[PDB]
């Protein structure tokens, strides 16, 4: 259903959609505007990368991530969800670390062409499914804005390897893996001169 943790099944790390809204209607990442999907009274199933923040760095298998809202940031809406799925008791004052983070709740992570000037790991073409990443920890920070913002650090912890590496680009080769594009979009353009 919508609140789903952990991954889709059938939907591989390595799969790529071209728009939102393909990412939404295959449930990895169910809001086709908001960077995140959460509950409030639960945790964060996903989110996307798409620059936003430059604080934010992006490092593959670890990357910072900067809250929503809002003035001063609260630890409400999705900036909580997001914080209940640190192994740790919620804390909205100084923020939390996961000693063993491993067993936070999992998010679903896509990264979007728009964040690749702040990333190199962000496609060069639509959206791509990069696996389960967890909170590791989080705090608030006075931002550029000069209100405070809530910052998170994830990392992550997927049995698939990472689309990136070489045994993550043998298993896209080999799944057959391609840019998915909605029915008649190409065609579409080409017949548009
Ligand atoms: O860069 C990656 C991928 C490779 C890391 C996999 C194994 C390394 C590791 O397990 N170290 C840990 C250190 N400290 C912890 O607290 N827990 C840990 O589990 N991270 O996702």
Same mark, same amino acid.
């Given at each position: 259903?919508?609140?789903?943790?952990?991954?889709?099944?059938?939907?591989?790390?390595?799969?790529? @959609?071209?728009?939102?809204? +393909?990412? #939404?209607?295959?449930?990895?990442?169910?809001?086709?505007?908001?960077?995140?999907?959460?509950?409030?009274?639960?945790? =964060?199933?996903? !989110?996307?990368?798409?620059?936003?923040?430059? &604080?934010?760095?992006?490092?593959?298998?670890?990357?910072?991530?900067?809250?929503?809202?809002?003035?001063? +940031?609260?630890?409400? %809406?999705?900036?909580?969800? !997001? $914080?209940?799925?640190?192994? =740790?008791?919620?804390?909205? +004052?100084?923020? =939390?670390?996961?000693?063993?983070?491993? #067993?936070?709740?999992? *998010?679903? *992570?896509?990264?979007?062409?728009?964040?690749?000037?702040? #990333?190199?790991?962000?496609?060069?073409?639509? %959206?791509?499914? &990069?696996?389960?990443?967890?909170?590791?920890?989080? @705090?608030?920070?006075?931002?550029? #804005?000069?209100? !405070?913002? @809530?910052?998170?650090?994830?990392?992550?912890?997927?049995?698939?390897?990472?689309? @990136?590496?070489?045994?993550?680009?043998?298993?896209?080769?080999? !799944?057959?893996?391609?840019? +998915?594009?909605?029915?008649?979009?190409?065609?579409?353009? $080409?017949? =548009?001169?």
């Amino acid at each position: 259903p919508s609140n789903h943790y952990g991954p889709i099944p059938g939907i591989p790390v390595g799969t790529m @959609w071209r728009f939102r809204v +393909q990412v #939404s209607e295959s449930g990895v990442h169910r809001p086709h505007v908001a960077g995140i999907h959460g509950r409030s009274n639960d945790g =964060a199933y996903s !989110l996307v990368l798409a620059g936003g923040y430059e &604080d934010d760095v992006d490092h593959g298998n670890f990357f910072t991530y900067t809250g929503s809202g809002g003035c001063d +940031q609260k630890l409400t %809406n999705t900036n909580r969800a !997001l $914080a209940l799925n640190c192994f =740790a008791p919620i804390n909205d +004052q100084e923020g =939390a670390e996961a000693k063993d983070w491993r #067993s936070g709740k999992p *998010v679903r *992570v896509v990264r979007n062409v728009k964040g690749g000037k702040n #990333s190199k790991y962000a496609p060069a073409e639509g %959206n791509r499914y &990069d696996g389960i990443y967890k909170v590791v920890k989080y @705090w608030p920070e006075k931002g550029k #804005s000069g209100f !405070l913002v @809530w910052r998170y650090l994830l990392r992550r912890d997927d049995d698939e390897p990472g689309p @990136w590496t070489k045994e993550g680009k043998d298993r896209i080769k080999k !799944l057959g893996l391609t840019m +998915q594009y909605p029915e008649g979009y190409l065609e579409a353009l $080409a017949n =548009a001169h």
